[PDB]
């Protein structure tokens with residue numbers, strides 16, 4: 661089997677991407693944030709504290725003839741941006757783009773942090789890291805991809821995120837029309853539960869490529885690109901007027917700037933992030949200072965190849981017995 665679904669930016673800055681997911685019988689369609697940096701599928705629901713719902717579509721398990729409470733199971737999660745949610749758990753039928761998993765753990769939120777409430781476009785998250793990160797207790801649950809893997813034509817999914825435009829998530833096949841050149845595959849460590857790999861280096865604009873190993877994770881659920889302070893300093897040094905702002909919480913730059921591209925190494929191959937991808941717009945409405953799309957990972961604890969990086973590429977999340985990651989230009 662295979663599945664294919666369109667993923668759409670939630671706003672003009674590509675702050676996140678939502679993908680329609682069918683849950684339950686008859687189908688309840690929620691727009692979920694596909695997140696390769698976590699492993700819980702959780703939804704706003706009829707159980708979410710009423711004051712914490714503001715425009716989201718909710719999952720009502722009592723209206724699904726296939727929903728079953730998973731007795732005693734609870735979940736609680738915090739993400740790299742400080743947001744969090746928690747609740748109880750049902751199993752139900754979940755379909756993405758024609759691909760169906762019966763008995764998927766659907767984690768029903770009782771509480772969400774303010775960041776989720778304030779984002780009316782995201783109805784929940786669909787985690788696609790490794791199931792060892794799943795937060796359900798006392799019985800850990802499998803991701804959608806994990807549950808679907810055996811049935812898929814090939815044990816893979818691909819992320820093809822658009823820059824200010826719709827994109828595609830495919831399960832079980834590689835669309836050879838969706839990228840240029842060849843796919844370079846690189847080894848993955850599952851030891852932390854993430855799609856963790858090692859970039860071979862970087863360049864800033866037309867500069868010379870620096871060979872240096874950068875361990876990081878491929879994370880569709882993070883907006884920006886978080887790299888070591890040395891790398892990030894080298895990038896923003898090429899931008900007149902750019903500075904790290906403690907008050908704003910990161911690198912900012914004059915909105916009048918044209919930004920240099922940023923290249924990251926995948927084995928012997930190169931992915932080039934266009935400069936425009938690194939512009940995340942005014943720090944506040946009307947401001948002439950703009951927030952940078954490349955930020956320091958210091959204090960985060962891990963380097964994160966977020967959407968800024970992943971949307972410059974066609975990305976293959978290969979869940980074979982020995983997982984690997986594939987990157988192609990597009």
Ligand SMILES: O=C(CCCl)NNC1=[NH+]CCN1
Pocket residue numbers: 695697698738739740741785879881882962964
């Ligand atoms: O939580 C992380 C970072 C793990 Cl190091 N990514 N996934 C995610 N989903 C919502 C915001 N962040």
